[PDB]
Amino acid sequence: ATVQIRQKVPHKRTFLFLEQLILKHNAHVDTISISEAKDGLDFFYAQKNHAVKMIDFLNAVVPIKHKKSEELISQDTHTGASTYKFSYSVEIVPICKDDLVVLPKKLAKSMGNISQFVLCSKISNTVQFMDPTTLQTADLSPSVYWRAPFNALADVTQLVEFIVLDVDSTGISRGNRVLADITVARTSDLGVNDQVYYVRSHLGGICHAGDSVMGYFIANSNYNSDLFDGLNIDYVPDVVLVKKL
Amino acid sequence: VNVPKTRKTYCKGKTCRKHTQHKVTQYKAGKASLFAQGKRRYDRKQSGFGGQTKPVFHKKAKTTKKVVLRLECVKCKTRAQLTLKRCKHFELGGEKKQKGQA
Amino acid sequence: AKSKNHTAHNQTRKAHRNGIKKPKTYKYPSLKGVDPKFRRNHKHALHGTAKALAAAKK
Amino acid sequence: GKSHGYRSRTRYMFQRDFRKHGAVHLSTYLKVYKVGDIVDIKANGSIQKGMPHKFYQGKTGVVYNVTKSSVGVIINKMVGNRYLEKRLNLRVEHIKHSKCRQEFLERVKANAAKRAEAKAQGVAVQLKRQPAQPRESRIVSTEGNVPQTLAPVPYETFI
Amino acid sequence: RRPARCYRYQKNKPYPKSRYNRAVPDSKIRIYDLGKKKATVDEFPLCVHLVSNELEQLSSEALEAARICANKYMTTVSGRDAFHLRVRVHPFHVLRINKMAWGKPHGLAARVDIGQIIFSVRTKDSNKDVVVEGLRRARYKFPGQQKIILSKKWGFTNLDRPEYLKKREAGEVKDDGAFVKFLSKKGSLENNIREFPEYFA
RNA sequence: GGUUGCGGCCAUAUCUACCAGAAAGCACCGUUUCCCGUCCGAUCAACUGUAGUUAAGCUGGUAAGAGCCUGACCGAGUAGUGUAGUGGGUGACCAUACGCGAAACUCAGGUGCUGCAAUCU
RNA sequence: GAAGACAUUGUCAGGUGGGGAGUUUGGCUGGGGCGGCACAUCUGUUAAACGAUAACGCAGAUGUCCUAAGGGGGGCUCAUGGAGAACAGAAAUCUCCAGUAGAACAAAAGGGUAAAAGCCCCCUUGAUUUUGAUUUUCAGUGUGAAUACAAACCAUGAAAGUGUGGCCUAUCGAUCCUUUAGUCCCUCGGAAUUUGAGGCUAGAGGUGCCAGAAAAGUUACCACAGGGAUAACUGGCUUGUGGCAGUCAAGCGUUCAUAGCGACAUUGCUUUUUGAUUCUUCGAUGUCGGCUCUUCCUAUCAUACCGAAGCAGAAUUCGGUAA
RNA sequence: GUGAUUUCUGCCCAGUGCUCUGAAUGUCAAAGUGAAGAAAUUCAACCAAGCGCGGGUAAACGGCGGGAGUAACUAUGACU
RNA sequence: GCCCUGAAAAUGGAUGGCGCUCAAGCGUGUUACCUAUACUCUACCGUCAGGGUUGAUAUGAUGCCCUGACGAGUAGGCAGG
RNA sequence: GUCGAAUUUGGGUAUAGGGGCGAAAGACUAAUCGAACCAUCUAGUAGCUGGUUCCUGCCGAAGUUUCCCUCAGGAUAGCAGAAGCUCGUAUCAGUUUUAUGAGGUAAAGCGAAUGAUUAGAGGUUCCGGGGUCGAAAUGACCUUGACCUAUUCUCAAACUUUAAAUAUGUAAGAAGUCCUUGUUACUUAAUUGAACGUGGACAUUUGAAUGAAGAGCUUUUAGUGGGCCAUUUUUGGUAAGCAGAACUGGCGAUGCGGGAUGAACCGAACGUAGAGUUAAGGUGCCGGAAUACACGCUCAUCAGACACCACAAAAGGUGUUAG
């Protein structure tokens, strides 16, 4: 038996996180050995039944999709139990925790009538997206994802330093001090001549003056997704603030 | 990457034929503009029964476009195109680089 | 159904049936690739020495 | 995956030397190349511009073109049952004369002198080379020279 | 563990531990010098070798088992301070097992050639018959066919028995602690007087 | 023959340690108005060859020196290797036949040669 | 009687629509699936001292980054060690001597580099225009990359000179369709003007299955052309493994190496295990087990005669001839 | 749909379906209306159903776990 | 060195069989002898190449004649029948 | 099993093919059902199996390169035949010698760099950590460790100063050499160079060896693109009549003498015959040919008898023979 775990992302973030949580509940009790790979790691389970216990652990914490195959070794004649060698192929959804993700049109109008240009907040069993301009959330089960798989537009490496000047709140809040207009300016164009950006963000409560936040700076990127090309360009924000520090 | 807004390169406009100052802007695609020839053909062929008659490309693998610049001369106003390599971040103008900093 | 991928056996005996023969030479080789500053002068040098033997020696 | 780059398998062949690193000496630049000079190719590893492909290490060609920092060299190369005529453009650090051609020019000047001098006397030009001949008979002397008898040795180990 | 008949002949290229290998089992043999290993060269004149005669591979553990059996014979007969054994052969070649296609590292092996010395013992002249039977009981542990040759040289020094005495009779031999340094004519003349006071006299 | 300028091959020319250097040449050296350049006339610039020295530089000599370099019936026709056998051996591998042939080691010697122009008891 | 300019029917237009129709559901591969990319590429090695060379061989890289990390000139020397200076220590700043690269050069590895190709300053656009010749993979086609010139216009430097992107080896893409720049030229064919449309020359929008289709499952109800090119059974080669037998002796056997046992090592046999391989059969060799019956083998449980013992007898253990 | 009788038929409206005496303008075709143009056209506003939001729905499809701390110690079919 | 022990497999069997013991065995040396479609010489066929020949041969110069070498073959190509 | 009822059954009549009917099996629908029977479109298509008709003469292959949703298939280059054309010692060559280049394998090296590795010794402390004299020291005095100097044992496919053999580049003269001096828009301070010439000189030893059933050039087109074996060099594998490569020879396509027997080994390549002599192997008999000659060894209650090849080991013998 083998639970082949794969994720198609070069920068592993969720793949690091699964190694920490596999040890907390300590699901690795029945591993004969642990091998790794290019884009994941492989496990070895002395009986068939120890592997099905593990997939039911992975179903609760991370979006997966699995299927099985087998092969013959012995072909025993008397009993009939021909001692096959099973294999389980697990694939994770390639969206990371703070990706910039442009939704397709049919999927965006199905859930919440949300705008297509969202972030990600809860990387857990369902993937939760969040519109940073106007706060509204929606969940995406893996059964809805793999029937039409898309990609993430950006990743956690295209983030730029930003320096907050003030926090101008509008007042409406979901649970986390929503829709604060933030006057922000990059670390690069701070000392040189004055260039100021002004944007809404969900980061209203934990944000104060003189602080460093990270965010996507859309105005200088030439993306090449067709979902991004099928938008209305003069509605796209310039900056999407992601996190503090 | 970063390119400046003012670039001095060769002009070919029947009066200059020499290096003059150019302005640098970024290339934008342009509208699809139906009543073109392939569109009036494709508008005829879809009509009727039979459904989709042309292939629709799905398996896309790139993540960047090449950056194209259009260089407009300031004297004779004769534009010229000039391409660059693939890059994920293209802004022009700001952040002239300084090496010695904290 | 695997197959034999690559070999160079019997490829030398096939080449030595018709011969590995030279391009074998020419007088007055072609001036494709020569410095074009040289070819532009070399045109006029032959035209003068043809005119020189034409009028003087007959 | 397989790899067939422009300088593959050239780890040792383009190394410089032992105790000959650094800039090149100036007699390389002062040598003069005319059209038709037989030149050998030996790729210098320091000068990257104008550099022959890894096939042409050691081959020998004819100069047909002379330009600013470079020469043109024709090389016969086999593929299949056929010799092609392939032209290169090498910078002058990578090129050098073949002395075997220059020693032929020195042998021609001797052949003109042997013919002209022996025409005045008037017999027996004798101009060709000859391979080495089996040697003559000769009488060897034992005077002050006794033949020293030898024998095969017994076996010793000394390990 | 596979029997050593599988791993007997030198087939593959030498495959040593390096930064490309990164993982080996530990060597079975660790200690190479036995007996009184702080003894001058003027003490034990007679040297006995064990020369191999077939081009083979000795495992690291066949070197270990023979090293003990040659030891425990010689100490019980002539005492543990009457000999000096030195294993001339170091194992470095890594053997691969295909434990069910590339092999995982399995054990270390030696690369023994014809004429190569495996063991070497230097003793007294009177303590000769104990040593030859001592290496004889180490011969059953190795594969192949080995033979014992008495050395014509003084101990481990690459000089013969009469040749060492005439250089030792002049003040040309000084003892570094386990081995002899020699005088050379070529070199500086002052520093050959700090060393060797008995010569030039 | 000494020196200077310009080089060629790039250790027989470098490296460590002492000693000697007539004549001229180099060099150290002396000043800060200008030209220029520095945190600093130290480096660089400029002015004087005057006030001073061969102490260093530099060339040369010594060392049973270190390195390098040519050699050799020095090791060695050894290790290797092409070709041939219904040759040996259970195999591993080794012999012979026709040919080619190292490196280390050992010993003996060596310690820059030269081109163009100038100038010197 | 109810109904009434509504419904109804006719045509076009959005929504819904496995109730139904049509099709598709990659390749390599120690069977096929899962994985992997050996499917485009790069360095070192395998590779057997020119070149060429394979496997799901080994150790690793790539889909980027850069108006400076590009181009030219000028200054200057680094890694590290030693000896010194308030706070100051193993690590801050300052100084001196040694310092052939042991540093750095955007990145994988391998080349290369010392009055530079490194570090620090000054000025910049050659990362530009016009098309040809050549090298590498190669059919001497494409695409990618590169080298050497010519005609122009420029950068830098006192000047020689170098510069047609990154010190060199990888970093990327056809027809059709859309689009922009260029000459502001050619055509819309009864004749003109203005709009629109079509052309020429040079770019971009992309095919990663990378010489480039637009594409989900299941069949234990199954079908046809075929394959022993290829699996499930016997035979064959092999012996890791399984089974069996030797040698050598450290030690156990209350005090003694071998009565009986035998650590650490080492040489073998066997084909009743199980693996490996795909040679024979897929126009079929009826594929478990038992019942029934004959013969063969010895590596001997019993019976015959013997040898040894830590064999007093009894009972037992070890070994020989012997099927 | 389940399958005589006796006896019971627990909790869950989130997903997917179904459904409604629910709010109003996010999406929003043809026809029609307004503006620019000499006109082909172009551009904007308006904009039915359905979707989306909100409510109901398990004898509809189906689902029924984990983690901590409670006056040393202890952690439940307790409690938070 | 030879030889013996080491040395155990299933139908009855294999230095090819018989059999061999100062060999009809192993090591080795000298001569004689046996025979392939191979080599040497001659005849015969054919193919190929180099040649001679106007007199007729009432004919064939698509013929007659001279000299020399060569001959395997599936797939396939051409030629005379 | 059931036998008075959801019973059995005649005749009439209704339901027809993507349709019927079904107390539900994908059952039945004229011996046909996971979609009938009959005719036509139809000689449907196939990269997949089977067959493919007369003789002789002559020449005679391929399983390899690049590309393809390509791997049971084609295009393309290769090998092959045919038809020839221009010419007839042209100048060529699976070869060697002379001269001259190029390379980093075999070996070698570690008191040579990088990287592993053994043993003691000589040193060094304002400066690793432990005892002692110690109020303490940047004191003295032991031990354990680090470094350091001179030695020592052993190594390397991805280490190297050095560096073979075998292979491989070119040259060995007519288009060549030398003297005189014309041309130009290139080049030079300069009729200085450059490149091409005019005119004269220099011939059979006109520039090493051997061979040349001719040399050069073109057009067109068949089959093939499943290969396998042996020696030496080699990769994965414990190993394989296993998998994957390098140079040459071979079988496939090919008989004949020999290995009893066999696609591949050893001899040797073939028109029909006669005579002669041999190759590889053989000469007790089957069997053509010496129960020849000569010097020794071995006696086996499993002898031994011929390469590829059809097997045997470590270890022991006062069996015997020579050292």
Side-chain angles (χ1 to χ4, degrees), chain E residues 2 11-12 38 101 176:
Chain E
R2 291 185 180 180
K11 288 185 179 182
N12 300 115
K38 284 176 63 64
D176 190 76

PDB file of all heavy atoms in Angstrom, chain E residues 2 11-12 38 101 176, chain J residues 120-121 150 236 238-239:
ATOM      1  N   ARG E   2      24.222 -11.029   2.610  1.00  0.00           N
ATOM      2  CA  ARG E   2      24.542 -11.929   1.514  1.00  0.00           C
ATOM      3  C   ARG E   2      25.874 -12.627   1.770  1.00  0.00           C
ATOM      4  O   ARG E   2      26.773 -12.041   2.382  1.00  0.00           O
ATOM      5  CB  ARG E   2      24.617 -11.168   0.192  1.00  0.00           C
ATOM      6  CG  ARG E   2      23.296 -10.652  -0.299  1.00  0.00           C
ATOM      7  CD  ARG E   2      23.459 -10.027  -1.657  1.00  0.00           C
ATOM      8  NE  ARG E   2      22.195  -9.512  -2.153  1.00  0.00           N
ATOM      9  CZ  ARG E   2      22.056  -8.910  -3.323  1.00  0.00           C
ATOM     10  NH1 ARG E   2      23.102  -8.759  -4.113  1.00  0.00           N
ATOM     11  NH2 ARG E   2      20.872  -8.461  -3.709  1.00  0.00           N
ATOM     12  N   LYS E  11      34.235  -6.412 -10.200  1.00  0.00           N
ATOM     13  CA  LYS E  11      33.469  -6.197 -11.422  1.00  0.00           C
ATOM     14  C   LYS E  11      33.270  -4.720 -11.735  1.00  0.00           C
ATOM     15  O   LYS E  11      33.666  -4.251 -12.803  1.00  0.00           O
ATOM     16  CB  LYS E  11      32.109  -6.897 -11.332  1.00  0.00           C
ATOM     17  CG  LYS E  11      32.181  -8.405 -11.415  1.00  0.00           C
ATOM     18  CD  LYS E  11      30.791  -9.016 -11.431  1.00  0.00           C
ATOM     19  CE  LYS E  11      30.861 -10.528 -11.541  1.00  0.00           C
ATOM     20  NZ  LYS E  11      29.514 -11.154 -11.606  1.00  0.00           N
ATOM     21  N   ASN E  12      32.662  -3.977 -10.821  1.00  0.00           N
ATOM     22  CA  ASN E  12      32.286  -2.612 -11.130  1.00  0.00           C
ATOM     23  C   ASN E  12      33.467  -1.669 -10.921  1.00  0.00           C
ATOM     24  O   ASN E  12      34.533  -2.061 -10.446  1.00  0.00           O
ATOM     25  CB  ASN E  12      31.102  -2.178 -10.269  1.00  0.00           C
ATOM     26  CG  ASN E  12      29.874  -3.043 -10.488  1.00  0.00           C
ATOM     27  OD1 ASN E  12      29.431  -3.738  -9.578  1.00  0.00           O
ATOM     28  ND2 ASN E  12      29.320  -3.006 -11.695  1.00  0.00           N
ATOM     29  N   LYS E  38      54.450   0.949  20.106  1.00  0.00           N
ATOM     30  CA  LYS E  38      55.482   1.934  20.396  1.00  0.00           C
ATOM     31  C   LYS E  38      56.781   1.172  20.626  1.00  0.00           C
ATOM     32  O   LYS E  38      57.179   0.906  21.760  1.00  0.00           O
ATOM     33  CB  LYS E  38      55.120   2.786  21.601  1.00  0.00           C
ATOM     34  CG  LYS E  38      54.072   3.833  21.330  1.00  0.00           C
ATOM     35  CD  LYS E  38      53.718   4.569  22.608  1.00  0.00           C
ATOM     36  CE  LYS E  38      54.922   5.323  23.142  1.00  0.00           C
ATOM     37  NZ  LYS E  38      55.331   6.386  22.193  1.00  0.00           N
ATOM     38  N   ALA E 101      16.297   0.831 -11.174  1.00  0.00           N
ATOM     39  CA  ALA E 101      16.891  -0.155 -10.277  1.00  0.00           C
ATOM     40  C   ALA E 101      18.321   0.223  -9.915  1.00  0.00           C
ATOM     41  O   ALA E 101      19.250  -0.020 -10.678  1.00  0.00           O
ATOM     42  CB  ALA E 101      16.857  -1.532 -10.906  1.00  0.00           C
ATOM     43  N   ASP E 176      62.495   8.325  15.252  1.00  0.00           N
ATOM     44  CA  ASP E 176      61.468   9.342  15.423  1.00  0.00           C
ATOM     45  C   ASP E 176      60.452   8.920  16.477  1.00  0.00           C
ATOM     46  O   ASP E 176      59.715   9.755  17.010  1.00  0.00           O
ATOM     47  CB  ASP E 176      60.788   9.618  14.083  1.00  0.00           C
ATOM     48  CG  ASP E 176      59.888  10.829  14.126  1.00  0.00           C
ATOM     49  OD1 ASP E 176      60.412  11.963  14.114  1.00  0.00           O
ATOM     50  OD2 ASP E 176      58.654  10.647  14.187  1.00  0.00           O
TER      51      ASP E 176
ATOM     52  P     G J 120      48.939   5.855  18.392  1.00  0.00           P
ATOM     53  OP1   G J 120      47.622   5.418  18.901  1.00  0.00           O
ATOM     54  OP2   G J 120      49.090   7.216  17.828  1.00  0.00           O
ATOM     55  O5'   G J 120      50.018   5.694  19.546  1.00  0.00           O
ATOM     56  C5'   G J 120      50.873   6.773  19.888  1.00  0.00           C
ATOM     57  C4'   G J 120      52.250   6.595  19.303  1.00  0.00           C
ATOM     58  O4'   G J 120      52.155   6.468  17.861  1.00  0.00           O
ATOM     59  C3'   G J 120      53.197   7.763  19.496  1.00  0.00           C
ATOM     60  O3'   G J 120      53.778   7.821  20.784  1.00  0.00           O
ATOM     61  C2'   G J 120      54.187   7.571  18.357  1.00  0.00           C
ATOM     62  O2'   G J 120      55.083   6.509  18.643  1.00  0.00           O
ATOM     63  C1'   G J 120      53.251   7.115  17.247  1.00  0.00           C
ATOM     64  N9    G J 120      52.740   8.263  16.475  1.00  0.00           N
ATOM     65  C8    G J 120      51.519   8.872  16.596  1.00  0.00           C
ATOM     66  N7    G J 120      51.357   9.871  15.778  1.00  0.00           N
ATOM     67  C5    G J 120      52.546   9.925  15.073  1.00  0.00           C
ATOM     68  C6    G J 120      52.963  10.799  14.045  1.00  0.00           C
ATOM     69  O6    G J 120      52.347  11.735  13.532  1.00  0.00           O
ATOM     70  N1    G J 120      54.244  10.502  13.611  1.00  0.00           N
ATOM     71  C2    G J 120      55.024   9.493  14.101  1.00  0.00           C
ATOM     72  N2    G J 120      56.236   9.363  13.555  1.00  0.00           N
ATOM     73  N3    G J 120      54.651   8.670  15.057  1.00  0.00           N
ATOM     74  C4    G J 120      53.409   8.943  15.493  1.00  0.00           C
ATOM     75  P     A J 121      53.824   9.227  21.552  1.00  0.00           P
ATOM     76  OP1   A J 121      54.244   8.969  22.952  1.00  0.00           O
ATOM     77  OP2   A J 121      52.544   9.930  21.286  1.00  0.00           O
ATOM     78  O5'   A J 121      54.996  10.017  20.816  1.00  0.00           O
ATOM     79  C5'   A J 121      56.297   9.459  20.741  1.00  0.00           C
ATOM     80  C4'   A J 121      57.150  10.144  19.706  1.00  0.00           C
ATOM     81  O4'   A J 121      56.474  10.178  18.423  1.00  0.00           O
ATOM     82  C3'   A J 121      57.488  11.597  19.965  1.00  0.00           C
ATOM     83  O3'   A J 121      58.509  11.766  20.929  1.00  0.00           O
ATOM     84  C2'   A J 121      57.881  12.082  18.581  1.00  0.00           C
ATOM     85  O2'   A J 121      59.188  11.640  18.256  1.00  0.00           O
ATOM     86  C1'   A J 121      56.887  11.323  17.703  1.00  0.00           C
ATOM     87  N9    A J 121      55.709  12.143  17.373  1.00  0.00           N
ATOM     88  C8    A J 121      54.414  11.924  17.751  1.00  0.00           C
ATOM     89  N7    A J 121      53.579  12.825  17.303  1.00  0.00           N
ATOM     90  C5    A J 121      54.380  13.694  16.583  1.00  0.00           C
ATOM     91  C6    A J 121      54.101  14.862  15.856  1.00  0.00           C
ATOM     92  N6    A J 121      52.882  15.386  15.731  1.00  0.00           N
ATOM     93  N1    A J 121      55.127  15.495  15.252  1.00  0.00           N
ATOM     94  C2    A J 121      56.356  14.986  15.373  1.00  0.00           C
ATOM     95  N3    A J 121      56.738  13.894  16.020  1.00  0.00           N
ATOM     96  C4    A J 121      55.696  13.288  16.613  1.00  0.00           C
ATOM     97  P     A J 150      57.150  20.683   7.467  1.00  0.00           P
ATOM     98  OP1   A J 150      57.837  21.315   6.318  1.00  0.00           O
ATOM     99  OP2   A J 150      55.702  20.380   7.380  1.00  0.00           O
ATOM    100  O5'   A J 150      57.922  19.331   7.791  1.00  0.00           O
ATOM    101  C5'   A J 150      59.336  19.278   7.724  1.00  0.00           C
ATOM    102  C4'   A J 150      59.880  18.047   8.399  1.00  0.00           C
ATOM    103  O4'   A J 150      59.375  17.970   9.753  1.00  0.00           O
ATOM    104  C3'   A J 150      59.490  16.711   7.789  1.00  0.00           C
ATOM    105  O3'   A J 150      60.279  16.367   6.664  1.00  0.00           O
ATOM    106  C2'   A J 150      59.669  15.758   8.957  1.00  0.00           C
ATOM    107  O2'   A J 150      61.042  15.466   9.148  1.00  0.00           O
ATOM    108  C1'   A J 150      59.202  16.621  10.123  1.00  0.00           C
ATOM    109  N9    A J 150      57.785  16.393  10.439  1.00  0.00           N
ATOM    110  C8    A J 150      56.699  17.146  10.099  1.00  0.00           C
ATOM    111  N7    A J 150      55.566  16.669  10.546  1.00  0.00           N
ATOM    112  C5    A J 150      55.942  15.522  11.218  1.00  0.00           C
ATOM    113  C6    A J 150      55.222  14.552  11.916  1.00  0.00           C
ATOM    114  N6    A J 150      53.900  14.587  12.061  1.00  0.00           N
ATOM    115  N1    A J 150      55.910  13.534  12.468  1.00  0.00           N
ATOM    116  C2    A J 150      57.237  13.492  12.328  1.00  0.00           C
ATOM    117  N3    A J 150      58.022  14.347  11.694  1.00  0.00           N
ATOM    118  C4    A J 150      57.303  15.342  11.159  1.00  0.00           C
ATOM    119  P     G J 236      27.218  -0.182 -12.752  1.00  0.00           P
ATOM    120  OP1   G J 236      27.461   0.624 -11.537  1.00  0.00           O
ATOM    121  OP2   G J 236      28.000  -1.412 -13.009  1.00  0.00           O
ATOM    122  O5'   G J 236      25.681  -0.579 -12.747  1.00  0.00           O
ATOM    123  C5'   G J 236      24.699   0.394 -12.454  1.00  0.00           C
ATOM    124  C4'   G J 236      23.312  -0.104 -12.754  1.00  0.00           C
ATOM    125  O4'   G J 236      23.215  -0.488 -14.148  1.00  0.00           O
ATOM    126  C3'   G J 236      22.866  -1.349 -12.016  1.00  0.00           C
ATOM    127  O3'   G J 236      22.472  -1.101 -10.679  1.00  0.00           O
ATOM    128  C2'   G J 236      21.739  -1.846 -12.900  1.00  0.00           C
ATOM    129  O2'   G J 236      20.590  -1.036 -12.730  1.00  0.00           O
ATOM    130  C1'   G J 236      22.310  -1.563 -14.281  1.00  0.00           C
ATOM    131  N9    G J 236      23.036  -2.731 -14.796  1.00  0.00           N
ATOM    132  C8    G J 236      24.387  -2.880 -14.883  1.00  0.00           C
ATOM    133  N7    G J 236      24.745  -4.029 -15.368  1.00  0.00           N
ATOM    134  C5    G J 236      23.552  -4.680 -15.604  1.00  0.00           C
ATOM    135  C6    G J 236      23.313  -5.968 -16.124  1.00  0.00           C
ATOM    136  O6    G J 236      24.131  -6.808 -16.498  1.00  0.00           O
ATOM    137  N1    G J 236      21.964  -6.247 -16.211  1.00  0.00           N
ATOM    138  C2    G J 236      20.971  -5.395 -15.830  1.00  0.00           C
ATOM    139  N2    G J 236      19.727  -5.858 -15.986  1.00  0.00           N
ATOM    140  N3    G J 236      21.176  -4.189 -15.338  1.00  0.00           N
ATOM    141  C4    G J 236      22.485  -3.897 -15.254  1.00  0.00           C
ATOM    142  P     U J 238      22.427  -6.802  -7.103  1.00  0.00           P
ATOM    143  OP1   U J 238      21.684  -7.298  -5.929  1.00  0.00           O
ATOM    144  OP2   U J 238      23.246  -5.573  -7.003  1.00  0.00           O
ATOM    145  O5'   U J 238      23.394  -7.950  -7.617  1.00  0.00           O
ATOM    146  C5'   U J 238      24.662  -8.150  -7.024  1.00  0.00           C
ATOM    147  C4'   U J 238      24.976  -9.617  -6.910  1.00  0.00           C
ATOM    148  O4'   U J 238      23.946 -10.278  -6.132  1.00  0.00           O
ATOM    149  C3'   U J 238      24.996 -10.387  -8.213  1.00  0.00           C
ATOM    150  O3'   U J 238      26.206 -10.237  -8.917  1.00  0.00           O
ATOM    151  C2'   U J 238      24.747 -11.811  -7.756  1.00  0.00           C
ATOM    152  O2'   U J 238      25.935 -12.377  -7.233  1.00  0.00           O
ATOM    153  C1'   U J 238      23.766 -11.595  -6.602  1.00  0.00           C
ATOM    154  N1    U J 238      22.359 -11.765  -7.026  1.00  0.00           N
ATOM    155  C2    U J 238      21.873 -13.042  -7.161  1.00  0.00           C
ATOM    156  O2    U J 238      22.529 -14.039  -6.939  1.00  0.00           O
ATOM    157  N3    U J 238      20.569 -13.132  -7.553  1.00  0.00           N
ATOM    158  C4    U J 238      19.715 -12.096  -7.829  1.00  0.00           C
ATOM    159  O4    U J 238      18.563 -12.338  -8.178  1.00  0.00           O
ATOM    160  C5    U J 238      20.283 -10.803  -7.673  1.00  0.00           C
ATOM    161  C6    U J 238      21.549 -10.691  -7.280  1.00  0.00           C
ATOM    162  P     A J 239      26.171  -9.944 -10.487  1.00  0.00           P
ATOM    163  OP1   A J 239      27.564  -9.880 -10.985  1.00  0.00           O
ATOM    164  OP2   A J 239      25.255  -8.800 -10.695  1.00  0.00           O
ATOM    165  O5'   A J 239      25.478 -11.236 -11.100  1.00  0.00           O
ATOM    166  C5'   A J 239      26.187 -12.458 -11.207  1.00  0.00           C
ATOM    167  C4'   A J 239      25.253 -13.600 -11.498  1.00  0.00           C
ATOM    168  O4'   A J 239      24.106 -13.502 -10.624  1.00  0.00           O
ATOM    169  C3'   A J 239      24.649 -13.633 -12.889  1.00  0.00           C
ATOM    170  O3'   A J 239      25.517 -14.218 -13.841  1.00  0.00           O
ATOM    171  C2'   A J 239      23.376 -14.431 -12.674  1.00  0.00           C
ATOM    172  O2'   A J 239      23.674 -15.812 -12.600  1.00  0.00           O
ATOM    173  C1'   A J 239      22.955 -13.966 -11.287  1.00  0.00           C
ATOM    174  N9    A J 239      21.963 -12.881 -11.334  1.00  0.00           N
ATOM    175  C8    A J 239      22.162 -11.533 -11.447  1.00  0.00           C
ATOM    176  N7    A J 239      21.055 -10.835 -11.454  1.00  0.00           N
ATOM    177  C5    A J 239      20.068 -11.794 -11.339  1.00  0.00           C
ATOM    178  C6    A J 239      18.675 -11.721 -11.287  1.00  0.00           C
ATOM    179  N6    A J 239      17.995 -10.580 -11.348  1.00  0.00           N
ATOM    180  N1    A J 239      17.985 -12.869 -11.172  1.00  0.00           N
ATOM    181  C2    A J 239      18.652 -14.023 -11.107  1.00  0.00           C
ATOM    182  N3    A J 239      19.963 -14.218 -11.148  1.00  0.00           N
ATOM    183  C4    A J 239      20.613 -13.054 -11.263  1.00  0.00           C
TER     184        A J 239
END
